[PDB]
Design a protein around this ligand. Structure first.
Ligand SMILES: OC[C@H]1O[C@H](O[C@H]2[C@H](O)[C@@H](O)[C@@H](O[C@H]3[C@H](O)[C@@H](O)[C@@H](O[C@H]4[C@H](O)[C@@H](O)[C@@H](O)O[C@@H]4CO)O[C@@H]3CO)O[C@@H]2CO)[C@H](O)[C@@H](O)[C@@H]1O
Length: 451
């Protein structure tokens, strides 16, 4: 879906260039490190013609104009469309099929004359609670369900009330993910869980255990390859290893979560992160690997494995790597325990388009045809819609997604999940980079999560 076409500049500036991709039916241009593929920024374009007209229209010339292009593409991507009556503004994260969703918007616009804009503003899930509070932001926000309880607690979300027959179309556990204080606060879309992704040409049988990875990396470095690369910057990707042997966010009792019973600093969590840091101290992995570096390395056949969600699969299809999707490795004999997210669509309490939003979500998006259009852009994984899931469940990659999900946990949607994530992210980066030891990083994470 992300298919490389060319570098824009004939000469690399400071080992940076602008990588131009065919992105489904659109174009994406990224400011990339030409050595490790690290992406510094990106913007979408309708077509190569629009890309060039934009580029030929920038100030400067020669390499100076490339630089200006890089500065424009690499600066923060801010919300552009403002809420208006008779329009829908949608925010969804940049790794999801937002062009497919826009196509669902076009079906809505054809039927109703209401235009539907889709954006992926940077840090949309942080921008939302600050601007929706004051009447701005989008009509509809997409994120995994863990963010939504914080939003609901602050009054930022309309209560959603699909009728019983609509509720019967989605799996009951996906409704539970978006239930907060006895109210539905979002429409569940898809069920996400990390899986192990491996190159069958480098690795016909993936390791069952994390403990095999150091030896695997040893023999692959000899052939100039890596065993495993994945995004070390976001705790979502490292959590499954941290949870495997006992780590948890909040203990869920008979009825509720106990925000005072935090488990980011127990023996299991310490063991998982220690194994992670040991991979780095032994140079099997690099503390600076982010999402783009790992993706580029795996899709070019430089590393035998990665850890990612379904939103990444079609990029690998395009790369033509002979890949498999399978259950995460065990740690200490215990299954890796990924946090399961339910991609969910909430309606802004400040939206003046609440009935149009409901109509868009229920009768356009949450249909076999609507989800397929999104899925064709970036795969959704398992979907909350039973009719569509029963067809997707025949795909072994979906079966593997659900196996990892079943070995994991649905994320809590309580307000403090935000604090938990921020604390675990700081703990992993500090332990990975050697700014802190494992024990002292997880001790601080313990503190920051429960406050
Ligand atoms: O300033 C530091 C960083 O702060 C911001 O990131 C925060 C988010 O605001 C928090 O919400 C949380 O993020 C969670 C996320 O809520 C959770 O759903 C999951 O995200 C997955 C997602 O489900 C999946 O579909 C796919 O998109 O991958 C996501 C993981 O990247 O896990 C997140 C935690 O890793 O915590 C993060 C900080 O870690 C801000 O957005 C960052 O840009 C900023 O650097």
């Amino acid at each position: 879906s992300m298919k490389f076409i060319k570098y824009l500049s004939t000469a690399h500036l400071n080992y940076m260039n602008i990588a131009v991709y065919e992105n489904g039916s659109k174009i994406k241009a990224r400011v990339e490190n030409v050595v490790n593929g690290k992406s510094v920024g990106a913007r979408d374009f309708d077509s190569t013609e629009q890309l060039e007209s934009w580029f030929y229209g920038l100030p400067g010339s020669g390499l100076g104009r490339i630089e200006n292009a890089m500065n424009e593409i690499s600066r923060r991507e801010n919300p552009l469309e403002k809420i208006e009556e008779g329009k829908l503004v949608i925010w969804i994260n940049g790794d999801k099929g937002y062009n497919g969703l826009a196509e669902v918007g076009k079906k809505f616009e054809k039927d109703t004359g209401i235009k539907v804009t889709v954006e992926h503003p940077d840090k949309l899930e942080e921008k939302f609670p600050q601007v929706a509070a004051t009447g701005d932001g989008p009509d509809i926000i997409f994120w995994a369900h863990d963010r939504f309880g914080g939003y609901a607690q602050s009054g930022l979300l309309a209560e959603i009330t699909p009728d019983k027959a609509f509720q019967d179309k989605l799996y009951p556990f996906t409704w539970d993910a978006v239930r907060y204080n006895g109210k539905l606060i979002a429409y569940p879309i898809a069920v996400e869980a990390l899986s192990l992704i491996y190159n069958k040409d480098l690795l016909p049988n993936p390791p069952k255990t994390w403990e095999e990875i150091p030896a695997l990396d040893k023999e692959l470095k000899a052939k100039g390859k890596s065993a495993l690369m994945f995004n070390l910057q976001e705790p979502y990707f490292t959590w499954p290893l941290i949870a495997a042997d006992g780590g948890y966010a909040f203990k869920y009792e008979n009825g509720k979560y106990d925000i005072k019973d935090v488990g980011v600093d127990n023996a299991g969590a310490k063991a998982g992160l220690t194994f992670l840091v040991d991979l780095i101290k032994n140079k099997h992995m690099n503390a600076d690997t982010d999402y783009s570096i790992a993706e580029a390395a795996f899709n070019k056949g430089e590393t035998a494995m990665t850890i990612n969600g379904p939103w990444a699969w079609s990029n690998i299809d395009t790369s033509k790597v002979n890949y498999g999707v399978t259950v995460l490795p065990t740690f200490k004999g215990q299954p890796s325990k990924p946090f399961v997210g339910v991609l969910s669509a909430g309606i802004n309490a400040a939206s003046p388009n609440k009935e149009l939003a409901k109509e868009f979500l229920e009768n356009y998006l949450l249909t076999d045809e609507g989800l397929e259009a999104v899925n064709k852009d970036k795969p959704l994984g398992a979907v909350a819609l039973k009719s569509y899931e029963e067809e997707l469940a025949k795909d072994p990659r979906i079966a593997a997604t659900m196996e990892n999900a079943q070995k994991g946990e649905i994320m809590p949607n309580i307000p403090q999940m935000s604090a938990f994530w921020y604390a675990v992210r700081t703990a992993v980066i500090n332990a990975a980079s050697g700014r802190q030891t494992v024990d002292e990083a997880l001790k601080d994470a313990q503190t920051n999560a429960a406050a």
